[PDB]
Design an enzyme around this catalytic site. Structure first.
Site, PDB file in Angstrom:
ATOM      1  N   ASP A   1       0.833  -1.299  -0.073  1.00  0.00           N
ATOM      2  CA  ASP A   1       0.062   0.091  -0.007  1.00  0.00           C
ATOM      3  C   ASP A   1       1.061   1.125   0.081  1.00  0.00           C
ATOM      4  O   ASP A   1       2.028   1.058   0.238  1.00  0.00           O
ATOM      5  CB  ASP A   1      -0.946   0.199   1.192  1.00  0.00           C
ATOM      6  CG  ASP A   1      -1.997   1.061   1.178  1.00  0.00           C
ATOM      7  OD1 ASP A   1      -2.228   1.717   0.169  1.00  0.00           O
ATOM      8  OD2 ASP A   1      -2.402   1.216   2.236  1.00  0.00           O
ATOM      9  N   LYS A   2       0.206   2.594  -0.591  1.00  0.00           N
ATOM     10  CA  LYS A   2       1.084   3.481  -0.338  1.00  0.00           C
ATOM     11  C   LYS A   2       0.542   4.424   0.590  1.00  0.00           C
ATOM     12  O   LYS A   2      -0.579   4.415   0.722  1.00  0.00           O
ATOM     13  CB  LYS A   2       1.353   4.218  -1.685  1.00  0.00           C
ATOM     14  CG  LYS A   2      -0.099   5.094  -2.262  1.00  0.00           C
ATOM     15  CD  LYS A   2       0.578   6.445  -2.742  1.00  0.00           C
ATOM     16  CE  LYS A   2      -0.791   7.447  -3.363  1.00  0.00           C
ATOM     17  NZ  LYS A   2      -0.417   8.693  -3.379  1.00  0.00           N
ATOM     18  N   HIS A   3       1.161   5.589   0.882  1.00  0.00           N
ATOM     19  CA  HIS A   3       0.922   6.605   1.705  1.00  0.00           C
ATOM     20  C   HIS A   3       1.400   7.938   1.564  1.00  0.00           C
ATOM     21  O   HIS A   3       2.573   7.941   1.067  1.00  0.00           O
ATOM     22  CB  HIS A   3       1.267   6.294   3.344  1.00  0.00           C
ATOM     23  CG  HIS A   3       0.731   7.003   4.183  1.00  0.00           C
ATOM     24  ND1 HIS A   3      -0.419   7.868   4.142  1.00  0.00           N
ATOM     25  CD2 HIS A   3       0.688   6.884   5.609  1.00  0.00           C
ATOM     26  CE1 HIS A   3      -0.774   8.566   4.983  1.00  0.00           C
ATOM     27  NE2 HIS A   3      -0.226   7.920   6.151  1.00  0.00           N
ATOM     28  N   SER A   4       0.473   8.929   1.228  1.00  0.00           N
ATOM     29  CA  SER A   4       0.876  10.280   1.101  1.00  0.00           C
ATOM     30  C   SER A   4       0.854  11.206   2.182  1.00  0.00           C
ATOM     31  O   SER A   4       0.263  10.943   3.266  1.00  0.00           O
ATOM     32  CB  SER A   4      -0.116  10.810  -0.280  1.00  0.00           C
ATOM     33  OG  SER A   4       0.364  12.117  -0.431  1.00  0.00           O
TER      34      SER A   4
ATOM     35  N   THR B   1      -9.519  10.715  -0.472  1.00  0.00           N
ATOM     36  CA  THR B   1     -10.081  10.104  -1.617  1.00  0.00           C
ATOM     37  C   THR B   1     -11.410   9.574  -1.355  1.00  0.00           C
ATOM     38  O   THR B   1     -12.155   9.465  -2.261  1.00  0.00           O
ATOM     39  CB  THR B   1      -8.853   9.081  -2.245  1.00  0.00           C
ATOM     40  OG1 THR B   1      -9.132   7.884  -1.232  1.00  0.00           O
ATOM     41  CG2 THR B   1      -7.550   9.353  -1.969  1.00  0.00           C
TER      42      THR B   1
ATOM     43  N   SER C   1       3.125   8.466  13.916  1.00  0.00           N
ATOM     44  CA  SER C   1       1.648   8.942  13.771  1.00  0.00           C
ATOM     45  C   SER C   1       1.123   8.449  12.512  1.00  0.00           C
ATOM     46  O   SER C   1       0.108   7.805  12.548  1.00  0.00           O
ATOM     47  CB  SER C   1       1.452  10.459  14.070  1.00  0.00           C
ATOM     48  OG  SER C   1       0.223  10.774  13.705  1.00  0.00           O
TER      49      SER C   1
ATOM     50  N   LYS D   1      -1.381   4.092  11.584  1.00  0.00           N
ATOM     51  CA  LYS D   1      -2.605   3.605  10.826  1.00  0.00           C
ATOM     52  C   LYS D   1      -2.036   2.609   9.833  1.00  0.00           C
ATOM     53  O   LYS D   1      -2.833   1.511   9.670  1.00  0.00           O
ATOM     54  CB  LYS D   1      -3.053   4.787  10.100  1.00  0.00           C
ATOM     55  CG  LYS D   1      -3.722   5.643  10.938  1.00  0.00           C
ATOM     56  CD  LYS D   1      -5.014   5.465  11.652  1.00  0.00           C
ATOM     57  CE  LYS D   1      -5.882   6.671  12.289  1.00  0.00           C
ATOM     58  NZ  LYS D   1      -5.783   6.674  13.715  1.00  0.00           N
ATOM     59  N   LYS D   2      -1.211   2.892   8.785  1.00  0.00           N
ATOM     60  CA  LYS D   2      -0.769   2.069   7.772  1.00  0.00           C
ATOM     61  C   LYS D   2      -0.304   0.731   8.135  1.00  0.00           C
ATOM     62  O   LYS D   2      -0.805  -0.477   7.767  1.00  0.00           O
ATOM     63  CB  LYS D   2       0.250   2.536   6.942  1.00  0.00           C
ATOM     64  CG  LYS D   2      -0.294   3.757   5.861  1.00  0.00           C
ATOM     65  CD  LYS D   2      -1.370   3.321   5.123  1.00  0.00           C
ATOM     66  CE  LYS D   2      -1.965   4.154   4.410  1.00  0.00           C
ATOM     67  NZ  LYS D   2      -3.265   3.940   3.577  1.00  0.00           N
TER      68      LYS D   2
END
Lengths: 440, 440
Positions: A83-86, A123, A186, A190-191
């Site tokens: 998965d990606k995170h921005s 999103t 932080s 979540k990820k």
């Protein structure tokens, strides 16, 4: 060990907190037994003493385990969980294309998103402009979509990283939010809850960037790579440009539309393309779906060209209650505004500057988002045909095309846009889209 | 200026807070608009950046002005407004003698005390062992006693330094209590509210001392002198010994009795005498009632010997609703316990050590104070005929004489005392009663 005061003191006196101590503190944050002041105090001691790599990993882990941690072992999937995170951005619609593309290459993407109240077009709200799209499937249903389709973009079923709820709220009012060790833990909390195998952070740089300076965006990128990889997840990060809107549009329906025309090659914004491709290559490599960049870029360009990618988007949308023919006939499903007019700058010239945050807030203010919560997003309002830095403007080329409700808010936004984009007599020096890749 | 977050940040980034900024923060503390976490955060930034002399004075002033500030200009008194302040101690009954003595020399002492819940035998509770003693006179009545009698020992009518209430409560649980700038302003806030002209801090040193080390007691003493004198009040401080009980007794009725026999020369503990005389000389000098130590000690020894001092104590007690013949016939007014027995150490020897805090808590535990609030102090329980360091003990000389309710708690305390006083084969090296005088 016990006592919040005890823990605060140790760290204050330049000591390293044990895992058991950090874990004890975090649960206390979650179970409301550790007061605001005790949270604000510890945050400050960390701002002055920082945290060693071990402490950094323990903080993140104790926050991840604060809530629920998904596990896909029982499902026995035949691929990597990635998965990606921005850090967010205006026009940053890469996730809608990224998810499908990587799943079409053997990767499983359990994208538990979480919109972005405050000033961030999440999103989750974009995907809700699609008639019937259910972003809240139960665990068993969610587990099904992943194995069947490969991707799934769902909203967090609360219990992910609860401790972060109170910790962040306190920090925001006590001036301890801008502390790299705290930010690192932080974001990843979540990820890392998704039970990932690999991850890729998209750290933005520029005016619309989270961190204030390039040197600070890079700083955060190096920190993220460290504790994630320390926590077991093969992570890398990229420094993407965010000195202007990424996609050629910003909003909700207008963006999901853009993500479809991309997936079908009907139109592809070149900058959005580079960032989208750059992130996927990382996921494939980290996931082991490729031995090198060349191999990865190859597989991806294929899936993007043989229609297999758009097919996955279409299967994801249908499995989450959207139309089963969304990709083919999206124009009949997505909300269309009453007024759509183009805005022109006062004079001819070259776009040299642009305030992303301004355009971002221009969208919200016209109904594109919510400032409170009780607000109900008009999933049809926004910008399209956005001007890129360097573009020459005049009666032939407007700054953007505004989709508004009425002539009033159209007029409002028109002034907002025109105020946010700065012109010049000559085209500015170009900047890279992807600055560099932090790794190991 | 506005924003608590704004202020916290400035100081966090090594900046100096303005008066207007410190003032804004403190009122917010008082008016409950500035949260616990915002208090705990600022306290920490100060623990890491300290506060410049100007900031130090502004903090104290903004705390003093938090509540009410007395003014004696309208009364047009013919003398200096002075008062002493201690950091507490066991047997520290100097205030009962000090007040009268200095008023008998032309000084006005508006002693707004405040007992000491937690583990501190406040004078307010001692004075309540006197039948009818009203420690709560209204402003106008209070103003009268001062002008007429000269002294008055009353309880704080709340609205003195309110901000300190919340500020201290937070600090106690967030590990920011041991910060000299914060302590300095906290202590003086209450006193500087009395509208003083001069002040004298009695900073204790030793086992029963507030600060942990002599170097830290001295450190605090120098800070106090600085901001007070900066705030307009001629201040000096002394480092008194507190490695044992000051008076020859600890309790309530037993101490007020001791203060009477002192005032009438019936008996005067030499150590208690030195500290009592040392503090008064300062007040006379600071107040301008004397040009030098010799002059002051002279005037004081006089008032102490011609009965004029005890006379003032008697006039103070009567004006505050006590008997009009308390000094002459105190033995009929003060509460007497059911059991009074002497305690002896297990072996013959010389008293070499003594835990003041232990004896202090031994008194409370036997009814001498309150651990909660709902407790009701037995104003008759306590110790008398206390052994001094260096005293040889045996069947001829007990450690103390215990005034208990019953044979049980007597027995309890007897073990407490015996455990708190350490013996040795030889007398220890003597220590000074008054170590030194900080000034200017």
């Amino acid at each position: 060990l016990f006592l919040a005061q005890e823990i605060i003191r140790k760290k204050r006196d330049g000591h390293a907190l044990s895992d058991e101590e950090i874990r004890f503190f975090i649960n206390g944050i979650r179970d409301n037994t550790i007061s605001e002041g005790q949270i604000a105090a510890l945050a400050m001691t960390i701002f002055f003493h920082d945290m060693t790599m071990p402490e950094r990993v323990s903080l993140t882990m104790a926050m991840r385990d604060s809530g629920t941690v998904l596990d896909w072992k029982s499902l026995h999937l035949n691929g990597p969980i990635v998965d990606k995170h921005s850090t967010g951005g205006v026009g940053d619609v890469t996730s809608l294309m990224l998810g499908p593309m990587v799943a079409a290459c053997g990767g499983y993407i359990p994208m538990i998103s979480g919109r972005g109240l405050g000033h961030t077009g999440g999103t989750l709200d974009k995907l809700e402009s699609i008639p019937g799209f259910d972003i809240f499937p139960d665990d068993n249903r969610f587990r099904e979509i992943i194995k069947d389709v490969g991707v799934a973009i769902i909203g967090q079923t609360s219990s992910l990283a609860p401790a972060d709820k109170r910790f962040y709220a306190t920090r925001d009012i006590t001036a301890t939010v801008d502390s790299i060790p705290l930010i690192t833990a932080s974001i990843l909390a979540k990820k890392l809850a998704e039970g990932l195998d690999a991850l890729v952070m998209d750290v933005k740089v520029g005016s619309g960037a989270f961190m204030p300076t390039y040197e600070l965006s890079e700083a955060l990128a190096e920190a993220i790579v460290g504790v994630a990889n320390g926590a077991g997840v093969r992570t890398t990060a990229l420094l993407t440009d965010m000195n202007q809107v990424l996609a050629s549009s910003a909003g909700n329906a207008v963006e999901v539309r853009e993500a479809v025309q991309f997936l079908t090659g009907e139109y592809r914004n070149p900058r959005l393309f580079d960032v989208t491709m750059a992130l996927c290559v990382e996921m494939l490599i980290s996931g082991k779906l490729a031995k090198d960049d060349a191999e990865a870029r190859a597989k991806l360009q294929a899936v993007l060209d043989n229609g297999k990618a758009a097919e996955v988007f279409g299967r994801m949308v249908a499995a989450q209650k959207g139309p089963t023919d969304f990709v083919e006939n999206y124009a009949k499903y997505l909300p269309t505004a009453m007024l759509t007019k183009a805005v022109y700058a006062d004079t001819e010239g070259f776009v040299s500057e642009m305030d992303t945050r301004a355009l971002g807030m221009a969208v919200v203010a016209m109904g594109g988002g919510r400032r409170q919560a009780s607000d109900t997003i008009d999933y049809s309002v926004g910008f399209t045909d956005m001007a890129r830095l360097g573009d020459q403007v005049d009666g032939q080329r407007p700054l953007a095309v505004i989709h508004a409700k009425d002539e009033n808010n159209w007029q409002e936004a028109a002034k907002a846009v025109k105020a946010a984009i700065k012109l010049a007599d000559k085209a500015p020096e170009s900047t890279p889209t992807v600055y560099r890749r932090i790794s190991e």
